[PDB]
Amino acid sequence: ADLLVKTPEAYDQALKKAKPGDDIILANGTWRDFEVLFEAKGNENKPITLRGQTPGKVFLTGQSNLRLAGEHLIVSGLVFKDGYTPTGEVIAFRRNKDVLASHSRVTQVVIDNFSNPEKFEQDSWVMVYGRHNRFDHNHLVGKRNKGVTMAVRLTTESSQQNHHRIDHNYFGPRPILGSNGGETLRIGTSHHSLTDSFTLVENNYFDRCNGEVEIISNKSGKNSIRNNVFFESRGTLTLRHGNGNIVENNVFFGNGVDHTGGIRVINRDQIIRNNYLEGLTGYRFGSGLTVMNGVPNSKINRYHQVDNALIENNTLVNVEHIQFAAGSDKERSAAPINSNMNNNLIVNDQGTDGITAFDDISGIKFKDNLLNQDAKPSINKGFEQADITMQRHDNGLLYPEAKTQQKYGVSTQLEPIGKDEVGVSWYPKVEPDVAFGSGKHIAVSPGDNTLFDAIASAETGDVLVLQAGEYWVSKILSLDKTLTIRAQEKGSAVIFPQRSTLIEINNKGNLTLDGVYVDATNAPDAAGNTLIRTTRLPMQRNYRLAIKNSTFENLDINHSYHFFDAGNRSFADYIEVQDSQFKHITGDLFRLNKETDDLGIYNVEYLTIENSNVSDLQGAIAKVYRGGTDESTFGPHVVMNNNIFNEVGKGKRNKSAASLILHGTQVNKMTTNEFNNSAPIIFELTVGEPKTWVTGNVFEGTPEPVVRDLFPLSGATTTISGNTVL
Amino acid sequence: ADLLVKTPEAYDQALKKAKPGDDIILANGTWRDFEVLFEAKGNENKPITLRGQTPGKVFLTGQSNLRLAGEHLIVSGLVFKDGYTPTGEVIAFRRNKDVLASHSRVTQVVIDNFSNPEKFEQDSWVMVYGRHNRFDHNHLVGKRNKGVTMAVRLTTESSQQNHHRIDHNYFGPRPILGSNGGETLRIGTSHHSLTDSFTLVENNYFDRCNGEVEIISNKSGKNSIRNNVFFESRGTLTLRHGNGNIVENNVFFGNGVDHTGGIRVINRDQIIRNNYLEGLTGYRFGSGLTVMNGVPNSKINRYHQVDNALIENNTLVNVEHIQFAAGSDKERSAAPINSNMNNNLIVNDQGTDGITAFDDISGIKFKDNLLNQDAKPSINKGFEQADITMQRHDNGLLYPEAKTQQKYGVSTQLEPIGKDEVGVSWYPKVEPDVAFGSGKHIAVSPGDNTLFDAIASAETGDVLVLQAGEYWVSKILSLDKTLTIRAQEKGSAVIFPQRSTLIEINNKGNLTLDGVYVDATNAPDAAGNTLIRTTRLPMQRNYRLAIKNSTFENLDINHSYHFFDAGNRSFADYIEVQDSQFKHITGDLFRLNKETDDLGIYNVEYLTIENSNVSDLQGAIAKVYRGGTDESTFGPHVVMNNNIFNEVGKGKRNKSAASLILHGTQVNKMTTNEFNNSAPIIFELTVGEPKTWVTGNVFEGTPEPVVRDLFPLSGATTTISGNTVL
Ligand SMILES: [Ca+2]
Ligand SMILES: [Ca+2]
């Protein structure tokens, strides 16, 4: 029988009355601050259902969440949005640790940007306990904060050997977290990784799941991860802890996007068969295919030696890196043993087979692997070369034209699940970001509060075109949308800040400055001004900052006048500076070093400064810091080319005594710059074999770059040469 | 004519029609977001008035402010609360730089906790410009953020030689700012300090104005500060810059409150006569009476030599410090010259006249000063001692009994203005802090978010009484009120956090824990947990934290598990730990070191740990930091006595390698502690002549204290002796 309810108390009363076969129906509307405890006992033949009256019209908002407890329950047709769970989880298959749900199903529910307001206040969106549950045809998009999106817990035997089924879900875009802990799916935990979970993960679509290196983090035994599609996801399927898992029939469409992986093999008895991998650009732990070194006598949460891996009938097309014994170093000294790699197909048009061995690989026996003839084989025995031309079948996958070559690599009967065969038909799959300049153009004129008003009434994506003249700014310009501020004619729009901050970047703010001119002469006569900064409230969301063709002068009325000051726990997807000039600044240029608690957190993924000019800066061009020993991320990337830096970094308040100090940055490229009469470049290299190239620069009146290796010799690939010193 | 008005548009119409002698009347109610520009032109005999219908029933809230412009205006009967100014000032005697107000009056207006949301976003509450303006019978209380409460500006000749009158105002309690910039009243600035202001500050009441070392900051010429009362104010009347000022007929009741000053003499031609000073405990620049050294050939904003000071007929009763040549060092090398101190009366029951000379004082001539015979004199000529009994007249002031002695000190005819003769009768003068345990007692039972529920529904000042049993906490406990959490029976109420934070202290939160037991075994297995912390959003006001008779154990499920984590720009009025136990904690105990930009800002006024036990703490007991060279504040104070510390501070993630790392702390007292098998105490002493006492401790298996001096050797009184080192 159907039990329509319109209030939480009516819900309570319906739940008390509900019998096997009944449906409790949440009436269409917005249910705010509704902590749902669905605790009942259905029947194998007659489940008890909680569902929205009209899927897509029942919203659970504010501090709402859902707990299932009992057995034979079904929950469907709900949307969580405009809020965040006040507990540890949005959806949990338990009341608490002693009262679980089993034989229960959550299907056709949406969680859409239901994120905690602080990125590093951790929660999870779905937590599975108990046994024989199902989580299917759901739609999870936009988790911005630390904490896996979905996990299977194994904390007691009652939650082990679960045979849980996770299928046909849309795992929509998840942006970069900026530390470890951004997984989309975690099965188990290191503590319980030697127990058998038997979890089935099939026919899900992972669409730009970019939280961190692990898209899926398998951390238990004897799971089956099969028939999933990974589209442009900036990470990997990692067999992290736990043994005896099967990774099969999965499809990875990297499309050449940066840092796309990958199947990563660690531990024992793994089977990696019949997987299709295309256009994957990642390396090291984010490679298209990775077989790691382990630690002898590893602790339960470190790295266990690869032993009896089986890697067969996989197809790898334009996979840039296949890495064996990856992570090899003084700790991870146990190379792979008793393993086998057979009947795979590697087609690469980049001239190489993409293979790199980092240690002895004689414990992997290679047999009957096929390579295209133009790809220099890195390994002789076990690889044969042939004239291969690939053509795409109807199932969207590439196969050798020759039928005889189809005994290598992936089966022809694969049928990748599509983006529109997953999730719910009644909730759209949408683009996560607003593009710069995707809106309309608004003419703005001088000269008092005119910029404050134009920003406030513009719409996201708009472009403000400032006419020539003077823009006096008596009120902070707080940006909570995507906006471009463009001078109609470069250098003809002059912006005069009169407050301690000119521009503040809030949640949802992203900023492009193009051709503007800023004279900070009239800023308040106080130390510690900051021309541009994020909000100082911990942000919920990443931001983008682009600076082009612009000039910034006279940030020097008092000391410690910084150009850009990142808020604690803030994260820029990128900061890009092109063709811009900076002169007379007492503070730092970019302060990207706030996370000094060494938990692997950092402030910027890509810092790029090219073709620019900086003169008379007391502080550093950039201070960027990522501390600790985490190997779960790919950034910061710091790229600086073709700049001229004069009299930079020597102020008595610059404790770094550097023009540039880079701690824990993973990719460093400094090329064709001039460092004239300035403080040195200083590298503080950490774990994860960072890559540094400092070539073609002039250091006139500037000391040579300083390298401090905090992990001798752990160890980085550091190329510093081809530079003129004085 | 009366122009009663109910909306801003009606006000605008009424303003256009107002003629000399008219009253524009804001109707009773709440005017939110009202930026009042009161610009009109009365005559000397018929002013134009803006006033509330019923004083006490007209409120300006939100982003409201007031600007007077023109002449012969009066504004009265308004309350600013529940908001903050969107400009630089709440009330400004100008429209803008070029359009001032003269011959105008602001009287009987209240500003009640109208502070910016963020303490270090600077504003001011009252700015006076022009000439012949009056600010009387107003009521200003609770400004929390950086920026002087009220200042007279002298930016152009039009605002100089003003003869402004500031009288009969209630300058109510102002909490400690935690940096420079917390003045209650400023007359001028350094740039204009050589111009004459002629401002009259008389018959005002300063009730616990504790913003910083300067209650009044005189920064201009020929002003008169007379007949004011300073009640338990944590600061001083400073003649900061500027010459020829008269400080006269003022009364200081310190009542023995900590860091009560004081008249501070700097610069030339000052007259300090007939002031009464009682019970003042301050020292150095916050002394009861200070005559500073100056800087030879000083910059305009530094310190000008005391030249031709006249100090006579003042009474000083139990003033612990009278200091001559205060601040003498290598920079401040110019001792007072051409000065005279005559006919003062010093009565002190502590054994001494309280005088200290820090340099040559032959530039001060003394004659006919009287001191009680029991007080050992520091100076011979110009002083005599005698038998004195003080008796308190009806004016509240002490006078010698022997009529012959009444030629020393203050006149018997002084009439100190009373707290209830100042401000307005229709608005109450209140206590600023909710006292712990002033509400009701509330019984709480075990155990599933019962603590969460009891906190949400309690009222400020209440006491929660925890019955025996287990308190599981699956939601963060957010404290936005004053609250005590007491175990019914010490030790039978056990609190089990399940989130990475147990207690979050928000704006208006203040917390006492008494007899509680916290077992953090079940916290999330994640690094960087924090049992107690402020909100990480920048706070609006200070907080208090008291921990008594409590036990905290097993903060060790992962690394960097901190007991208490201060947010950026947060400030504790105090943190006090008594008779409590802390064991098995991987992080730091108290993280009070967030303000590393060296602007003089800090996180705690008083940190006190006594009679407590800390065992197996990987991090430091406390990291407290105050950076830079500011001398405008009194804290931090760090007091630790009679504790037992076993195995503290030797963790590999404690970069300080200290059990205690104290930088820029001004008062340090560690006595009768046991430090067993622990990392050392480390001092990093800064400017301001800090006082450090480390005596009577046992350092067994612990290095003896390390002293690093940043400014060798400009003061610092460091006594480390009588410790046992095994
Ligand atoms: Ca991970
Ligand atoms: Ca001051």
**A347, A382, A405 - which closes a domain:** A405
At B631, the amino acid letter reads E
Q: Where are the alpha helices (DSSP H) in A307-393?
A: none
Domain co-membership, B513 together with B376:
no
Same domain, yes or no: B157 and B254:
yes
Is the CB of B599 inside 8 Å of chain A's CB atoms?
yes
- Domain shared by A471 and A600, yes or no: yes
The secondary structure of residue A373, as a DSSP letter, is T
The answer to whether position A130 is within a domain reads yes
CA of A341 to the centre of ligand 1 (A): 26
Neighbour-count burial for A59-87, b at 16+ CB within 10 Å, e otherwise: bbbeebbbbbbbbbbbbbbbbbbebbbbb
Are the C-beta atoms of A638 and A622 separated by less than 8 Å? yes
Q: d(Cα A5, Cα A12) in Å, to the nearest integer?
A: 9
SS3 content of chain A, % helix, strand, coil (to 5): 5, 45, 50
Where b means 16+ CB within 10 Å and e means fewer, A134-149 reads bbbbbbbbbbbbbbbb
Q: Resolution in angstroms, to 1 decimal, for this deposition?
A: 2.2
Contact A131, A107 (CB under 8 A): no
Q: How far is CA A687 from the centre of its chain?
A: 19
Calculate the alpha carbon distances from B519 to A121, A297, B447, B585 in Å: 21, 32, 14, 11
Question: Are residues B470 and B377 both part of a single domain?
Answer: no
Cβ neighbours of A568 in B, within 8 Å:
536, 568
Give A683 to chain B, closest Cα distance, Å: 19
- DSSP E strand boundaries for B537-580: 543-548, 551-555, 562-565, 572-578
Q: Are B394 and B537 in a shared domain?
A: no
Amino acid letter at B661? Answer: I
Task: Specify whether A389 is located in the same domain as A480.
Answer: no
Sign of torsion, CA A205 A262 A179 B586?
positive
Give the largest CA-CA distance in chain A: 86
* Rounded-to-10 torsion of CA A12, A14, A17, A19: -120
- Other residues' Cβ atoms within 10 Å of the Cβ of residue B394: 6
The CA distance from A241 to B274, in Å, is 81
Could you tell me which of A75, A89, A82 has the C-alpha nearest to residue A59? Answer: A82
- In angstroms, the Cα distances linking A545 to A145, A577, A598, B558 are 20, 8, 25, 35
> Distance between CA B167 and CA B185 in Å, rounded?
12
Distance from CA of B398 to the nearest CA of A (A): 45
> Which amino acid, one-letter code, is at A105?
R
Residue B480 sits in the same domain as residue B398:
no
- Assess whether A562 and A614 both reside in one domain: yes
What's the full length of chain B, in residues? Answer: 726
A238 and A294 housed in the same domain: yes
Exposure class string for B592-621: b at 16+ Cβ within 10 A, else e: bbbbebbbbbbbbbbbbbbebebbbbbbbb
- Can you say whether residue A361 is alpha, beta or left, with left for phi > 0 and alpha for psi between -120 and 50 degrees? alpha
Q: Which H helix or E strand runs over B16?
A: helix B8-17
Structure tokens at A718: 């550091």
Angle at A521 between CA A520 and CA A525, to 5 degrees: 100
Interfacial B residues in 562-581 facing A (CB < 8 Å): 568-569
| A427, part of any domain | no
Per the entry, the structure determination technique was X-ray
- Spatial separation of the C-alpha atoms in residues B199 and B369, rounded to whole Å: 31
Neighbours of B260 (CB within 10 A): 29
Residue where a domain terminates, one of B405, B431, B457 = B405
Domain shared by B590 and B708, yes or no: yes
- Cα torsion for A614, A616, A617, A618, to the nearest 10°? 160
The DSSP H or E segment spanning B76 is strand B73-83
A10: enclosing H helix or E strand: helix A8-17
The answer to whether B423 and B138 have CB atoms below 8 angstroms apart is: yes
Find the CATH number of the domain harbouring A640: 2.160.20.10
Question: What distance in Å separates the CA atoms of residue A589 and residue A592, rounded to the nearest whole number?
Answer: 10
Amino acid identity at B509: G
Shared domain for B391 and B493, answered yes or no, is: no
CA-wise closest residue to A538 among B542, B65, B333, B535: B535
| Interacting residues of B494 by C-beta distance below 8 A, sequence separation 6+ | B469, B470, B471, B517, B518, B519
Q: Tokens at residue B212, please?
A: 């910083």
Question: Could you say which of B405, B427, B453 is where a domain stops?
Answer: B405
- For residue B430, is it within any domain? no
Range of the domain at B220: 2-405
DSSP B490: T
Integer angstrom CA distances of residue B649 from A656, B227, B356, B621, B681: 26, 54, 40, 7, 10
Any A CB within 8 A of B527 CB? yes
Residue type, B455: I
Cis (ω within 30 of 0) for the bond into B262? yes
Q: Is residue A419 part of a domain?
A: no
Token pair recorded at residue A41: 């006992």
Mark out the alpha helices in B599-710 (DSSP H runs): none
Name the burial class of residue B22, with classes exposed (0-12), middle (13-18) and buried (19+) by CB atoms within 10 angstroms of its CB.
Answer: buried
Return the structure tokens found at A56: 């897509």
Measured between alpha carbons, how far is B677 from B717 in angstroms, rounded to an integer? 28
Q: Which chain A residue's Cα is nearest to B627?
A: A653
Rounded-to-integer distance, Cα A232 and Cα A143, Å: 17
Nearest to A597 among B118, B560, B568 (CB): B560
In 3D space, the residue among A606, A175, A117 whose CA is nearest the CA of residue A433 turns out to be A175
B597 vs A181, A528, A598: nearest CB: A528
Q: Rounded to an integer, what distance in angstroms lies between the CA atom of residue B272 and that of residue B274?
A: 7
Helix%, strand%, coil% for chain B, nearest 5: 5, 45, 50
Q: Which residues of A touch B500 (CB under 8 A)?
A: 121-122
Cα–Cα dist A603/A662, whole Å = 12
Residue A316 CB contacts under 8 Å (≥ 6 apart), including other chains: A277, A278, A288, A289, A322, A344, A345, A346, A347, A348, A354, A409
| CA B97 centroid distance within chain | 31
Nearest-Cα distance to chain B for A104, in Å, is 24
Is residue B401 domain-shared with residue B453, that is, in the same domain?
no
Strand order in the sheet with B706-709: B477-479, B501-505, B530-534, B562-565, B590-592, B622-625, B660-663, B681-685, B706-709
Domain count, chain B: 2
In a domain, A416, yes or no: no
Which residues, other chains included, contact A116 with Cβ-Cβ below 8 Å and sequence gap of 6+?
A: A84, A85, A122, A123, A145, A540
Q: Residues with Cβ < 8 Å from B74, sequence gap 6 or more?
A: B47, B48, B49, B50, B51, B104, B105, B106, B107
Q: Kindly state the tokens that stand for A113.
A: 């940007």
Determine the Cα–Cα distance for residues A346 and A367; give it in Å rounded to an integer: 13
The reply to whether residue B474 touches residue A88, judged by beta carbons under 8 angstroms, is yes
The answer as to whether A683 is a domain residue is yes
Q: Is residue A693 part of a domain?
A: yes
Distance from Cα A184 to the centre of ligand 1, integer Å: 10
Q: What is the 3-state secondary structure (H, E, C) of A232-270?
A: CCCCEEEEEECCCCEEECCEEECCCCCCCCCEEECCECC
Do B448 and B194 touch, CB atoms closer than 8 A? no
User: Chain B contact for A714, CB < 8 A?
Assistant: no
Closest CA to A177 of A474, A541, A552, A677: A541
For residue B713, whether the previous peptide bond is cis, meaning omega lies within 30 degrees of 0, is yes
The amino acid at residue B554 is N
Of A96, A528, A599, the CB nearest to B560: A599
How far apart, in whole angstroms, are the C-alpha atoms of residue A258 and residue B500? 34
Cβ–Cβ under 8 Å, residues A96 and A547: no
- The tokens describing A8, both together, are 């939480």
Cα dihedral B399, B400, B401, B407 sign: negative
Tell me the three-class secondary structure of A376-433, residue by residue: ECCCCCCEEEECCCEEECCCCCEEECCHHHHHCCCCCCCCCCCHHHCCCCCCCCCCCC
Please, which residues have CB within 8 angstroms of residue B367's CB and are 6 or more apart in sequence? B340, B342, B343, B382
Interchain contact A295–B (C-beta under 8 A): no
B429 within some domain: no
b/e sequence A633-661, b meaning 16+ C-beta within 10 Å: bbbbbbbbbebbbbbbbbbeebebbbbbb
SS3 for A284? helix
